[PDB]
Design a binder for this molecule. Structure first.
Ligand SMILES: [Mg+2]
Ligand SMILES: [Mg+2]
Ligand SMILES: [Mg+2]
Ligand SMILES: [Mg+2]
Ligand SMILES: [Mg+2]
Ligand SMILES: [Mg+2]
Ligand SMILES: [Mg+2]
Ligand SMILES: [Mg+2]
Ligand SMILES: [Mg+2]
Ligand SMILES: [Mg+2]
Ligand SMILES: [Mg+2]
Length: 127
RNA sequence: AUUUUGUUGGUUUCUAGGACCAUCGUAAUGAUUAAUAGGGACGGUCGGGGGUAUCAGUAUUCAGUUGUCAGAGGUGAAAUU
């Protein structure tokens, strides 16, 4: 039927990565980040930039032959926050609305079975 | 050592007295509860109680292979990087 890639979307709170690989993930097809679409650091992770980033990925996917993708959304993970950034929701909707077909969707955020120490100190970040 | 042998040392038998030792007989012969105190034993347990080894788990960082290409990071915004 369709030809599947894998859209590995890494959505932090400072930027948004839209990265499409092959099934193995060892071959990169298109990687457009929200920071390549704006010149202000404060909105590298904006929903608007993520939508533009996804459209460039979808356009690149079409000329290589990728007609469908599986979605593996992730947050920063590790010792830091596990909730996805604001751009992850926009990049997913933009991909679906760009004529690309959507397969399986999974959250693959790095979660610890314990945890190393997290930055900020004992008293947290005082603002 | 309490008396007397006419009498003082007497003298050790003697008399009597505790104090014990044995036998026999008397006797209803002789040991308070087990504290909704405690201690101990025992029986099935119950615990992220302790110690010594041992086996996971992803994560973090670093490294090796790869893959593409212009930003990535970070913030309230930036900059150092
Ligand atoms: Mg940023
Ligand atoms: Mg830029
Ligand atoms: Mg610049
Ligand atoms: Mg540090
Ligand atoms: Mg405050
Ligand atoms: Mg006389
Ligand atoms: Mg008792
Ligand atoms: Mg026992
Ligand atoms: Mg996992
Ligand atoms: Mg520059
Ligand atoms: Mg950035």
């Amino acid at each position: 039927s369709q030809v599947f890639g894998v859209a590995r979307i890494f959505a932090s709170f400072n930027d948004t990565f839209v990265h499409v690989t092959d099934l193995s993930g060892k071959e990169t097809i298109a990687r457009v980040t929200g920071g390549m679409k704006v010149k202000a650091d404060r909105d590298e992770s904006s929903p608007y930039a993520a939508m533009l980033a996804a459209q460039d990925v979808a356009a690149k996917c079409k000329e290589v032959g990728i007609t469908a993708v599986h979605i593996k959304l992730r947050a920063t993970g590790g010792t830091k926050t596990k909730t996805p950034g604001p751009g992850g929701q926009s990049a997913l909707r933009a991909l679906a609305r760009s004529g690309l077909r959507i397969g399986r969707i999974e959250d693959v955020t790095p979660v610890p079975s314990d945890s190393t120490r997290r930055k900020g100190g004992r008293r947290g970040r005082r603002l």
